[PDB]
Amino acid sequence: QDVVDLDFFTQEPLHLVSPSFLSVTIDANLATDPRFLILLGSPKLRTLARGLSPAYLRFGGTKTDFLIFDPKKESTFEERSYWQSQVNQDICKYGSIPPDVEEKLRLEWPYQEQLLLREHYQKKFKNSTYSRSSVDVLYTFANCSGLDLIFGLNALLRTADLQWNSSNAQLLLDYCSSKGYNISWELGNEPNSFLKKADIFINGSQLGEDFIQLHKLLRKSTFKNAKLYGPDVGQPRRKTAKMLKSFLKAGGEVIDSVTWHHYYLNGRTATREDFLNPDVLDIFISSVQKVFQVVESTRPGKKVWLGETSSAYGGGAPLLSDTFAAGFMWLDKLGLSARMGIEVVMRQVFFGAGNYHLVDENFDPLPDYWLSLLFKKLVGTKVLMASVQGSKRRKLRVYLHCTNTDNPRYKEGDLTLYAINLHNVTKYLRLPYPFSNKQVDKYLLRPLGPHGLLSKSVQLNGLTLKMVDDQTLPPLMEKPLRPGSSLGLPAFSYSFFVIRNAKVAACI
Ligand SMILES: *[C@@H]1O[C@H](CO)[C@@H](O[C@@H]2O[C@H](CO)[C@@H](O[C@@H]3O[C@H](CO)[C@@H](O)[C@H](O)[C@@H]3O)[C@H](O)[C@H]2NC(C)=O)[C@H](O)[C@H]1NC(C)=O
Ligand SMILES: *[C@@H]1O[C@H](CO[C@@H]2O[C@@H](C)[C@@H](O)[C@@H](O)[C@@H]2O)[C@@H](O)[C@H](O)[C@H]1NC(C)=O
Ligand SMILES: *[C@@H]1O[C@H](CO)[C@@H](O)[C@H](O)[C@H]1NC(C)=O
Ligand SMILES: *[C@@H]1O[C@H](CO)[C@@H](O)[C@H](O)[C@H]1NC(C)=O
């Protein structure tokens, strides 16, 4: 019997996630050579980013601590040409990249991506500077896409006696004020590895004092209520958890959320079997619990965010992080993050170097994009609970929220269920009373073509998902089911199910 009874716990929300729960990053290394930020002027990338609104866009990464704002930095032919074409034009409606500039940057980009990835793996970072125009590219991309920019400041600018030197930050904050920019801030990226990356050790008490310093600058700015997030530590291995604890004790008062990072695997060694292994999926739960321990003992009730996360570190697992098979880790991470109290999850990366990107080198969406878009359209902020009967929940993983209220097909009280089947056979889910004779809309994702799970193309209810054109996402078409029918989930797949007229009081 491959028929599994669901239990639903709908009486009240377990947690409330932000409307921006599914958020994204742009790696700070896109600014190593700032010409490549102009790729963010693509109308195709804008269309795709808009599909994920509301969301935060976090500009950060290892390079956050090797970037220096220079208000007099010279621009390049690419940058000068891009900005010259936007003059006297509504950039959000009509902005594009000049075709010569677009062609050149796209020819150079695969070399650049190799450089960025190898620089990362060798841990040989140099300081580089970025201009006012670079800031403007990031700001307008985010603003035109309906995203909220979070900008990571360089925490390795240091005085003689090991204190953060805030003078470059001040330059930047003043520039942003003078343009009317609504930006939230971070300081430093993965401070736990500063010793390896820069042979400077900054401990968490000191980093907290640095955050205190920054908060004081933000209070004196024209944007007095700008938000401040930190400390963007790596996942909570012993020394990292100790550093998080000391940081929160010293600087925990001035941060609006606690940010940490997670990757399941080393991209160099990850296997196909690891991507489908529920034991790999389950280790994320240990990371989450350790984080909440540190936070509850120092700043209880403080919001906890995943500030940078994906399948595999080192730029992603080649031939795996950009596939349908990467969806199991991504959907499960969202499911668990919601159910365990994480308020925002920031996906490394929307676009950029690596293959854990949502959108590729030709600005085409990967399967994880489509998964993210369907999640955004269907899943609401109120987290409920589901479970499967029989204590084999490892391979059939289920999550339940109120249906997204912004969705015009659905109404107050409707439920969105989502489910992952990691068995090698089809499973059938039976809804419990009082949801057992309802109209249900199915949204089943399956990979397209001969590579099966390793495909980079995906179908929704048997229709290939593809952008209509550069300005247009497709409709995501439900498959209505017979009332009372069980919910069928093929081997190695994932699906959403919207329970219509469910009338759940908690979702109203
Ligand atoms: C976290 O990092 C800070 C460094 O920013 C450490 O603070 C420093 O700690 C040492 C104590 O071992 C201080 O050295 C002492 O200085 C006094 C003079 O002020 C001198 O009388 C002592 O003989 C000794 O040399 C140093 O001043 C201090 N710096 C600051 C700015 O406070 C801190 O100890 C570290 N904490 C942990 C738990 O690792
Ligand atoms: C499939 O997985 C097996 C273990 O899973 C169990 O058996 C399968 C057929 C389903 O009934 C599932 O619900 C069970 O949890 C492995 O031992 C077996 O080697 C695998 N079979 C194939 C054909 O790959
Ligand atoms: C980067 O520049 C800052 C100040 O401009 C300096 O303190 C730091 O040591 C430099 N680091 C590297 C790795 O070049
Ligand atoms: C901070 O950095 C600025 C700009 O590089 C430098 O001129 C200044 O001396 C530094 N301040 C301290 C307190 O070290």
Side-chain angles (χ1 to χ4, degrees):
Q1 187 165 137
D2 295 317
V3 180
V4 185
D5 289 354
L6 293 162
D7 284 350
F8 279 8
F9 312 77
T10 53
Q11 248 201 26
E12 55 193 293
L14 280 285
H15 299 287
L16 187 68
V17 297
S18 162
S20 293
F21 173 67
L22 199 169
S23 279
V24 300
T25 74
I26 293 294
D27 200 307
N29 71 0
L30 199 56
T32 304
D33 182 344
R35 285 189 296 147
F36 292 99
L37 291 162
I38 298 301
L39 292 172
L40 302 176
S42 164
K44 197 175 172 197
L45 279 185
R46 193 174 63 210
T47 298
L48 292 161
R50 257 162 196 150
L52 302 182
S53 189
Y56 295 100
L57 182 72
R58 180 257 184 169
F59 181 72
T62 300
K63 193 75 197 180
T64 295
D65 300 302
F66 303 92
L67 279 173
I68 296 160
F69 181 43
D70 177 12
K72 305 155 184 166
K73 182 196 171 81
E74 295 155 302
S75 50
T76 60
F77 160 73
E78 288 89 340
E79 289 163 321
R80 228 177 317 96
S81 177
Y82 170 75
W83 288 111
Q84 281 170 15
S85 61
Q86 308 327 317
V87 163
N88 293 344
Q89 208 163 69
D90 188 341
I91 193 177
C92 301
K93 274 200 159 191
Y94 301 124
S96 60
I97 302 166
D100 56 311
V101 177
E102 192 172 310
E103 185 177 331
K104 185 181 170 182
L105 288 173
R106 290 179 63 161
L107 290 177
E108 292 202 56
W109 174 253
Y111 179 36
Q112 182 70 0
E113 174 171 39
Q114 288 301 311
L115 296 174
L116 297 178
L117 291 168
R118 301 312 173 116
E119 193 188 304
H120 187 77
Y121 186 54
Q122 291 172 20
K123 294 272 139 64
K124 289 179 173 178
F125 303 96
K126 296 174 179 77
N127 285 337
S128 55
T129 61
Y130 59 94
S131 70
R132 283 165 300 161
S133 87
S134 302
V135 179
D136 299 342
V137 168
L138 280 156
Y139 190 79
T140 66
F141 175 66
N143 194 53
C144 298
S145 301
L147 309 177
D148 295 309
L149 188 65
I150 305 174
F151 192 109
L153 301 164
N154 184 338
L156 287 183
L157 299 168
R158 288 281 146 174
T159 61
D161 62 0
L162 316 155
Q163 305 287 119
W164 181 57
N165 179 335
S166 66
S167 63
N168 194 243
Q170 260 279 57
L171 293 191
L172 182 57
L173 294 176
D174 289 354
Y175 174 64
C176 290
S177 287
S178 78
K179 309 301 296 195
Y181 292 167
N182 183 356
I183 293 167
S184 305
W185 307 90
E186 292 174 345
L187 181 56
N189 176 84
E190 298 179 0
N192 56 285
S193 74
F194 282 168
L195 183 41
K196 177 167 192 209
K197 294 182 304 200
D199 37 65
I200 311 171
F201 179 63
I202 298 301
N203 71 33
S205 306
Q206 180 61 241
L207 189 66
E209 292 302 321
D210 304 328
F211 272 68
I212 290 175
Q213 248 192 288
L214 176 52
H215 183 250
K216 294 187 211 283
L217 297 173
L218 297 185
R219 289 299 100 120
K220 303 176 218 167
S221 70
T222 40
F223 280 90
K224 289 195 162 142
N225 309 118
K227 304 285 182 170
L228 174 54
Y229 310 112
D232 277 277
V233 279
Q235 58 213 81
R237 287 144 184 151
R238 187 173 44 79
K239 296 176 163 170
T240 299
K242 185 165 196 196
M243 180 175 295
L244 176 58
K245 186 170 188 156
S246 63
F247 167 81
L248 286 175
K249 274 181 178 171
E253 205 169 37
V254 300
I255 61 172
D256 299 288
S257 304
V258 180
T259 46
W260 64 289
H261 297 176
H262 177 273
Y263 296 82
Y264 292 90
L265 300 163
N266 188 347
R268 298 185 139 275
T269 54
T271 66
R272 192 184 159 289
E273 292 66 41
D274 296 326
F275 274 57
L276 313 175
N277 187 346
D279 301 323
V280 171
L281 296 183
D282 287 350
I283 64 156
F284 174 64
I285 300 168
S286 179
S287 273
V288 175
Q289 293 163 357
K290 289 169 180 161
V291 166
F292 276 88
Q293 268 179 51
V294 172
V295 179
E296 191 179 303
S297 71
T298 59
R299 305 280 164 182
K302 184 69 71 167
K303 295 316 196 182
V304 176
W305 285 9
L306 268 169
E308 185 198 296
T309 201
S310 205
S311 46
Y313 61 83
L319 307 170
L320 297 161
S321 294
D322 55 353
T323 68
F324 177 90
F328 299 106
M329 271 169 168
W330 182 220
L331 189 59
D332 201 69
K333 174 163 284 160
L334 291 169
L336 280 173
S337 286
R339 195 175 69 206
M340 299 182 77
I342 296 169
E343 193 193 41
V344 174
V345 177
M346 297 177 200
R347 174 57 181 267
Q348 176 82 354
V349 70
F350 178 65
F351 170 92
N355 72 327
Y356 52 24
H357 53 201
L358 293 177
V359 180
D360 73 12
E361 59 268 26
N362 303 318
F363 313 136
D364 294 314
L366 294 158
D368 272 2
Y369 179 84
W370 293 115
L371 173 60
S372 304
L373 183 65
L374 197 59
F375 196 99
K376 182 77 53 169
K377 294 330 173 204
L378 301 175
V379 179
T381 52
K382 290 176 185 174
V383 190
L384 308 173
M385 186 161 357
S387 68
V388 293
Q389 288 176 14
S391 81
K392 281 212 143 166
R393 311 162 180 171
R394 274 172 69 264
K395 286 193 284 175
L396 198 56
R397 306 174 76 89
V398 295
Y399 304 101
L400 187 70
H401 299 216
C402 303
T403 302
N404 182 347
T405 61
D406 287 318
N407 194 313
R409 182 166 167 91
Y410 300 120
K411 55 174 162 161
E412 267 60 61
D414 282 354
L415 289 176
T416 301
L417 171 75
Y418 52 106
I420 294 169
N421 181 19
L422 286 169
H423 294 96
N424 55 34
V425 301
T426 306
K427 295 289 173 179
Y428 300 88
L429 293 316
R430 292 205 305 194
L431 291 171
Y433 185 84
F435 312 112
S436 53
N437 205 13
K438 299 282 168 178
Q439 302 290 4
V440 174
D441 283 345
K442 179 173 182 164
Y443 296 88
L444 171 64
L445 295 169
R446 307 290 304 292
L448 173 73
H451 306 296
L453 296 184
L454 307 189
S455 178
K456 296 190 222 293
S457 283
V458 68
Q459 308 195 295
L460 177 58
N461 301 323
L463 198 167
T464 299
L465 289 182
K466 269 271 159 38
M467 297 191 72
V468 167
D469 68 25
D470 282 14
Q471 276 77 39
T472 318
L473 302 168
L476 307 168
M477 294 173 189
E478 73 277 8
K479 172 161 189 195
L481 300 179
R482 174 197 300 179
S485 68
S486 62
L487 314 181
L489 209 54
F492 305 118
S493 66
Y494 36 86
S495 187
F496 304 79
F497 302 86
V498 182
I499 304 176
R500 304 181 71 191
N501 199 35
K503 286 181 283 171
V504 169
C507 302
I508 300 168

